[PDB]
C-alpha cells in the first residue's frame, strides 16, 4: 500500500497473507478468507509458483513479523483457477483456495460477505485496499497491515490510461487523478473492499497495474460481482 | 526483485568456444522472455539472441546466426549461450536480460545482468 | 530489416536543463520503443516502453513519446544523476538499438 496507514485488530479480519516457504519463507500475495474453508485470492499469486505443497497461509494477523515456526497457518488442500484464466494476463485473476481444515471464526479472523445479487449497478462510494505490499514502487514489503481508501473510476476512464490492454466489464479500476494512493507489489491477491448500506462487500481483487500511486494510472481489480455464479458453483 | 548473474567470459582464441551462464534469483509473478545483448569496446549495444518460452523459439542476430546457441535449464534458473567458432569482433561484454511477458503487475518490464567480459584473441 | 537512427549523436545539457532526444524507425514499429540508460561499464537501465510509458521506479522527469517511426525521450530538467549514454530500441521484432546519444556536462 502507497500512501496508506496502519490497520487495527478486527479492523480487516478476512485479510490473510499468502507466503512461500522454500529455502526462505516469503509473502507473496494477499488473499480474502470468504468462508471456513475458503479464500479468494488472484490466479496470477500462483503463475511462478503452482505447487500448492509449498503455500501457507496467515489469517488472524496484523505484522508479519510476529510470525515464527509456531505461528499456526492453514494448507491448501485445492487451488481453482477460473477455466478461462491465461498465464501473465489480466482476464478472468482469480482463484478459490480450499484449506486443509476449517478455520473457526474469531474477532480477529472472519469472512467477507460477496457482492450481493441485487447490487449488480450500485456505484460504490466508500472503498479501501489493503495489504503488506511495497509502499513505493521498487520498495519493500510493509510490517504493519496497511489501509489506504481509493474511489474507484469507470471503465472508460480506465482504459484511457492503458491504451495497450483492453479493460473488460470483469475488471473494475481505482484511483486519484493526482495518484499518491494505490495498492503495489505484495498486495495483489487481496481485497478491494467497500462498505454499502453499512455492510463491508469484496467488490475487488488486487490484480494488476502500471506502477504504483502515479497521477493518472489506476489500478486494475477482478471485479468479484461477475464471478458470483462460478465462485457458488465451485464452492458448492 | 529478480537478480542476474552472469559467469562464463573470459579468454579465448579464434576458432574456439565459449559457454556463458546467466543465473537468475529470487521470487517473481512473472514469466519473462530472456536476451543476451553485448557491447565490443567504445562501441553501442548490440542484440544478439533470444529465446521466448523454456521450450519455445530462439532467434538469433544475423551476425551470430550458426556458431551461437541460446538455451535455459529451469532445474538451475540459468540461461545459456554456447558460442561457437568464436572471432575477433566477438569480443565484448555480454549481458542477459529478462523481459516480462503480459501486463504490469506493479513490477519491472526488464530486469539486466551484470555483464561478463569475453576476449577472443590469438 | 530495422534500422533505427538516434540525433544527435552528442548533447551539452547543464543541471536542470529540458533535453530531448530523437530516434527515427526505417519502417512503422507502432510503439515497441524503449529507452534506456547506460552508465560507462554498467548495465544498462531501461526508463520507458511502449514508447510512453515509464518502467516501474523511473523518476517521473523521464517521458517519452511517438509512435510509427519517429519518438523522442524527453528528460525535464536534467538532474546530476542524468549525465549518461541513451540508447533506445525497437522490439517489433526482435530487438535493435539504435546507435545512441551521449547527454554530456557543458560549461
Known amino acids: 500500500i502507497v500512501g496508506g496507514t496502519e490497520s487495527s485488530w478486527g479492523e480487516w479480519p478476512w485479510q490473510v497473507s499468502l507466503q512461500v516457504k522454500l529455502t526462505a519463507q516469503r509473502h507473496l500475495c494477499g488473499g480474502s478468507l470468504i468462508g471456513h474453508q475458503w479464500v479468494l485470492t488472484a490466479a496470477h499469486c500462483f503463475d511462478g509458483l503452482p505447487l500448492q505443497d509449498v503455500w501457507r497461509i496467515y489469517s488472524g494477523i496484523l505484522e508479519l513479523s510476529d510470525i515464527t515456526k509456531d505461528t499456526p497457518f492453514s494448507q491448501i488442500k485445492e487451488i481453482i483457477i477460473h477455466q478461462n484464466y491465461k498465464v501473465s494476463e489480466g482476464n478472468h485473476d482469480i482463484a478459490l483456495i480450499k484449506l486443509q481444515a476449517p478455520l473457526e471464526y474469531t474477532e480477529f479472523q472472519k469472512p467477507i460477505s460477496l457482492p450481493s445479487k441485487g447490487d449488480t449497478s450500485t456505484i460504490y462510494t466508500n472503498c479501501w485496499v489493503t495489504g503488506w505490499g511495497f509502499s513505493k514502487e521498487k520498495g519493500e514489503i510493509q510490517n504493519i497491515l496497511q489501509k489506504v481508501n481509493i474511489p474507484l473510476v469507470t471503465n472508460e476512464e480506465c482504459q484511457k490510461r492503458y491504451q495497450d490492454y483492453k479493460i473488460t466489464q470483469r475488471m473494475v479500476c481505482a484511483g486519484y487523478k493526482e495518484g499518491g494512493k494505490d495498492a503495489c507489489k505484495g498486495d495483489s491477491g487481496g481485497p478491494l473492499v467497500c462498505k454499502h448500506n453499512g455492510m463491508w462487500r469484496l467488490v475487488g481483487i488486487t490484480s494488476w497495474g502500471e506502477g504504483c500511486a502515479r497521477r493518472e494510472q489506476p489500478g486494475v481489480y477482478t471485479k468479484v460481482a461477475e464471478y458470483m455464479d462460478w465462485i457458488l458453483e465451485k464452492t458448492q | 526483485e529478480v537478480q542476474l548473474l552472469e559467469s562464463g567470459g573470459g579468454l579465448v582464441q579464434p576458432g574456439g568456444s565459449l559457454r556463458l551462464s546467466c543465473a537468475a534469483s529470487?521470487?517473481?509473478?512473472?514469466?519473462?522472455?530472456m536476451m543476451w545483448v553485448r557491447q565490443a569496446p567504445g562501441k553501442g549495444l548490440e542484440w544478439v539472441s533470444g529465446?521466448?518460452?523454456?521450450?519455445?523459439?530462439?532467434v538469433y542476430a544475423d551476425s551470430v546466426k550458426g556458431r551461437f546457441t541460446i538455451s535455459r535449464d529451469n532445474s538451475k534458473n540459468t540461461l545459456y549461450l554456447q558460442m561457437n567458432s568464436l572471432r575477433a569482433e566477438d569480443t565484448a561484454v555480454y549481458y542477459c536480460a529478462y523481459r516480462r511477458i503480459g501486463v504490469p503487475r506493479r513490477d519491472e518490464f526488464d530486469i539486466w545482468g551484470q555483464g561478463t567480459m569475453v576476449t577472443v584473441s590469438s | 530489416d530495422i534500422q533505427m537512427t538516434q540525433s544527435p549523436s552528442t548533447l551539452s545539457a547543464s543541471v536542470g536543463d529540458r533535453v530531448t532526444i530523437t530516434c527515427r524507425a526505417s519502417?512503422?514499429?507502432?510503439?515497441?520503443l524503449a529507452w534506456y540508460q547506460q552508465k560507462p561499464g554498467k548495465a544498462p537501465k531501461l526508463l520507458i516502453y511502449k514508447a510512453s510509458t515509464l518502467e516501474s521506479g523511473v523518476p517521473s522527469r523521464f517521458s517519452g513519446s511517438g509512435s510509427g517511426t519517429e519518438f523522442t525521450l524527453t528528460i525535464s530538467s536534467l538532474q546530476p544523476d542524468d549525465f549518461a549514454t541513451y540508447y533506445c530500441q525497437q522490439y517489433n521484432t526482435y530487438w535493435t538499438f539504435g546507435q545512441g546519444t551521449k547527454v554530456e556536462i557543458k560549461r
Open positions: 519502417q512503422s514499429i507502432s510503439s515497441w
Open positions: 529470487g521470487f517473481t509473478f512473472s514469466h519473462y522472455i
Open positions: 529465446i521466448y518460452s523454456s521450450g519455445g523459439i530462439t
